[PDB]
Amino acid sequence: PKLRALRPHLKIDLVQEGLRIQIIDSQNRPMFKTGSAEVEPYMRDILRAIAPVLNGIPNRISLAGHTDDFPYANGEKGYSNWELSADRANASRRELVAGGLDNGKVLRVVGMAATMRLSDRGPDDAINRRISLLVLNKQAEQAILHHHHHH
Amino acid sequence: KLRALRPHLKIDLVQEGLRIQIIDSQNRPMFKTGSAEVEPYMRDILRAIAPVLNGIPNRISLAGHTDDFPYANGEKGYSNWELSADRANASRRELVAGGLDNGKVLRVVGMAATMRLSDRGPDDAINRRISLLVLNKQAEQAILHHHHHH
């Protein structure tokens, strides 16, 4: 019934590095109030809903935030998309943990700002605001583990 | 600044490029405990390397490492995850203040206490560090390709 409402927000697909779960915004429905890193009610439900499922998968997670709220012609000297994307990723992280997801599964939190946007400013830029959960392969995990021992 | 920063500033070469690490010391932290606002000394170092980094035509990834909060608990609220991300973003804002172009920043990462180098013994100061990674073109494309489906 309400799976029609999840359909334009929950984007699941298989990626080389593993299982990517994207929670994207709509024109009429955002997962976060514009400029805010506070979880919207509907966003709260989705994260607590997939948390018990993800906890059943023996693999670890990487969280990445994407946001288009603040300008990037900004110069980004104060609170920008970098802080916002990182905060929204961590906000999603806290909800997942509250949903029953073991905290030990979290491996990385990433702020992407708007560097990975798909649309320009306009009636389509809702897709630029998304949270990406990446359930990693054992090989992809080993690569990232290795990379951040170099970082 | 002969040996005022050299116990704090480490520079080494890795596969992905040039890694610039800013490490805490036992008696001189780069951030006050639990806080993500930059210390007066941190601000100086960051603005001292910002103009140099701006000269290098390569882009940068920021990463923070923290063990201020207990990872043995549930990490249900504000934890090392938020603190490491905020400290990375705080270092980021001090870099653009030092004249570094914001377009050079490619990624901000919180790693919490995952990449911890030492248990909470005598000198566990190394567990608290900010890592600047100046990426070569190969590593930059990889990270771009990776996050393009992340």
Swiss-Prot record, chain B:
Entry's localization field: Cell inner membrane
The UniProt record lists the OmpA-like domain at 18-138
UniProt superkingdom: Bacteria
Query: What does this gene product do?
Result: MotA and MotB comprise the stator element of the flagellar motor complex. Required for the rotation of the flagellar motor. Might be a linker that fastens the torque-generating machinery to the cell wall.
> Into which family does the record put it?
Belongs to the MotB family.
| Assembly and interaction partners | Each stator complex is composed of 4 MotA and 2 MotB subunits. 2 A subunits and 1 B subunit are thought to form a single ion channel, so that each stator complex contains two channels.
Q: Tell me the protein's name.
A: Motility protein B
Which source organism? Answer: Salmonella typhimurium (strain LT2 / SGSC1412 / ATCC 700720)
Encoding gene, per UniProt annotation? motB
